[PDB]
Amino acid sequence: GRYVPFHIQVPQKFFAIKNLLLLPGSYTYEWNFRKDVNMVLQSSLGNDLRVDGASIKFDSICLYATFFPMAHNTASTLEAMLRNDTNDQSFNDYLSAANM
Amino acid sequence: KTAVDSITQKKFLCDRTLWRIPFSSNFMSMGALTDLGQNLLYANSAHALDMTFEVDPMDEPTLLYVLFEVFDVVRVHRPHRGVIETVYLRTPFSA
Amino acid sequence: KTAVDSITQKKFLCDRTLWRIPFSSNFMSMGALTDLGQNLLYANSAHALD
Amino acid sequence: GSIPYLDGTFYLNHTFKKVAITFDSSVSWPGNDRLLTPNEFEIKRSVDGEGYNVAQCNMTKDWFLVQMLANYNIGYQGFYIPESYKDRMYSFFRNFQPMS
Amino acid sequence: MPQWSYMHISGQDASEYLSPGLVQFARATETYFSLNNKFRNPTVA
Amino acid sequence: PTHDVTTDRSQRLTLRFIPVDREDTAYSYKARFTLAVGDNRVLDMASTYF
């Protein structure tokens, strides 16, 4: 059907956040989204969808995350160890290049 | 039997790939920080760059996409419950 | 242009498999004898299931 | 014909709705507020609005998660396409056919 | 160089710059809660 | 292991979040989630999804 009420699951793709182990605390997670049909959609013929009638309206959005059911003493020792200066976490990009 | 005289036409196709020129003396992947990458002449000195590409002519504009392979690293420190500091490094080409 | 108003029907098929609920605390294959398989409550008492 | 009890050709897996596990009189399993429905594993839901379905079918996230942890132990470090050698003919993903 | 090492680009081995107790803990919990990908291993020609 | 790994303590294996604030323009939209990582809650970010 041309009319589709849809549901879609989308991950975090930025290298630092997506290999991170997040320790106890409260933290803000905020993002900005694209609605432009010529970017968010793909057609086999590449025709302009703004002019030829495709449209999208986003009813709602939900967020999900999975947690380990770890022992509290172990959990405390593992939080303690990663808050130390010598034990900072380290990441790098797979593509790792400047684009021109 | 009735065959004309003929000439031969050769060509090739190569879809999906990126062409790669690694910064190594023998051009081998022997590790990511390369031997030219460790040498002292290059390291303490400044250099300008001039590359010249030949490509085939098109009947509408095109783009040459050059990826400069650099290191793009991040260090992550979380000092207290709810606080987080981040140290970003990109070399060559630092912002 | 003339498209009728529509509803969406979603489904799946899954042939050749059994539904599995392994008996473990965090649902992991950490050992053939599960950790849960060994705890005292199930081992030192009798329990009926429904 | 084929004999599913012997040769393994099961196909009515889809005809289950939800499962409730209860030890003695009111002793819940796994319980301790581990799932959004804590006392029952809900396999499928007709038109979710609460965001509990997944993967473009009507199977739930919680169940999908469970099946991935039981079959391949993937869950905790996130979803990805299971290894080809592990994902055999009788394994879940290999046989998963979402439709809309 | 100094500041490469500080940022672990030209640094030492991951098992060697992490606290031992933590190394030891990571080696016990690897197969069922992977920690290798969290920390850099720099390859050097 | 029957110790020093898992717990029998209360807590959710997976958390659902609904936006605090959403703002929308004619081409774009930003969403706000507040991630409350509790006492002894261990979260690998690779498992995150909208």
Swiss-Prot record, chain C:
Q: Which residues of the full protein are shown?
A: 853 to 902 of 952
Biological source species: Human adenovirus C serotype 5
- Where is this protein found? Virion; Host nucleus
On assembly, the entry states:
Homotrimer. Interacts with the capsid vertex protein; this interaction binds the peripentonal hexons to the neighboring penton base. Interacts with the hexon-linking protein; this interaction tethers the hexons surrounding the penton to those situated in the central plate of the facet. Interacts with the hexon-interlacing protein; this interaction lashes the hexons together. Interacts with host dyneins DYNC1LI1 and DYNC1I2; this interaction might be involved in intracellular microtubule-dependent transport of incoming viral capsid.
Q: Tell me the disulfide pairings in this chain.
A: none
Described by its record, this protein's role is as follows: Major capsid protein that self-associates to form 240 hexon trimers, each in the shape of a hexagon, building most of the pseudo T=25 capsid. Assembled into trimeric units with the help of the chaperone shutoff protein. Transported by pre-protein VI to the nucleus where it associates with other structural proteins to form an empty capsid. Might be involved, through its interaction with host dyneins, in the intracellular microtubule-dependent transport of incoming viral capsid to the nucleus.
Q: Which gene encodes it?
A: L3
Please, what other remarks does the record include? All late proteins expressed from the major late promoter are produced by alternative splicing and alternative polyadenylation of the same gene giving rise to non-overlapping ORFs. A leader sequence is present in the N-terminus of all these mRNAs and is recognized by the viral shutoff protein to provide expression although conventional translation via ribosome scanning from the cap has been shut off in the host cell.
Q: What protein family is recorded?
A: Belongs to the adenoviridae hexon protein family.
| Regulation: induction | Expressed in the late phase of the viral replicative cycle.
Protein name as catalogued: Hexon protein
From Swiss-Prot, chain D:
Q: Write out the annotated subcellular location.
A: Virion; Host nucleus
Which superkingdom heads the taxonomic lineage of this protein's source?
A: Viruses
Site features described as Involved in interaction with pre-protein VI, chain residue numbers: 75
Inducing or repressing factors = Expressed in the late phase of the viral replicative cycle.
Q: Anything further noted?
A: All late proteins expressed from the major late promoter are produced by alternative splicing and alternative polyadenylation of the same gene giving rise to non-overlapping ORFs. A leader sequence is present in the N-terminus of all these mRNAs and is recognized by the viral shutoff protein to provide expression although conventional translation via ribosome scanning from the cap has been shut off in the host cell.
What is known about its subunit structure? Homotrimer. Interacts with the capsid vertex protein; this interaction binds the peripentonal hexons to the neighboring penton base. Interacts with the hexon-linking protein; this interaction tethers the hexons surrounding the penton to those situated in the central plate of the facet. Interacts with the hexon-interlacing protein; this interaction lashes the hexons together. Interacts with host dyneins DYNC1LI1 and DYNC1I2; this interaction might be involved in intracellular microtubule-dependent transport of incoming viral capsid.
**The family this protein is said to belong to:** Belongs to the adenoviridae hexon protein family.
The protein's job, in short, is: Major capsid protein that self-associates to form 240 hexon trimers, each in the shape of a hexagon, building most of the pseudo T=25 capsid. Assembled into trimeric units with the help of the chaperone shutoff protein. Transported by pre-protein VI to the nucleus where it associates with other structural proteins to form an empty capsid. Might be involved, through its interaction with host dyneins, in the intracellular microtubule-dependent transport of incoming viral capsid to the nucleus.
* Name of the protein in its database record: Hexon protein
- The species this protein was found in: Human adenovirus C serotype 5 (HAdV-5)
Starting at the broadest rank, the lineage of the source organism is: Viruses, Varidnaviria, Bamfordvirae, Preplasmiviricota, Tectiliviricetes
- Relative to the complete UniProt sequence, the shown stretch is 703 to 802 of 952
